[PDB]
């Protein structure tokens, strides 16, 4: 349980790693409690 990749990706999406920010979005899938 940790749905932060959204607001966390928003960072990398404009902090110097958008392409990598897309990787963060993958953490959003984190739904294993």
């Amino acid at each position: 349980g940790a749905d932060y990749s959204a607001q966390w990706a928003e960072y990398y999406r404009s902090v110097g790693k958008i392409e990598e920010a897309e990787a963060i979005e993958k953490t959003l899938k984190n739904k294993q409690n």
Binding site: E10, Y11, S14, V15, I24
Partner: peptide
């Protein structure tokens, strides 16, 4: 199949931005 290859670096670093409206 594609075997990854890289270091680790993504825990909980302080946030850079914070939007605005």
């Amino acid at each position: 199949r594609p075997p990854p290859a890289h270091h680790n670096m993504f825990s909980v670093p302080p946030p850079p931005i914070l939007g605005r409206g």
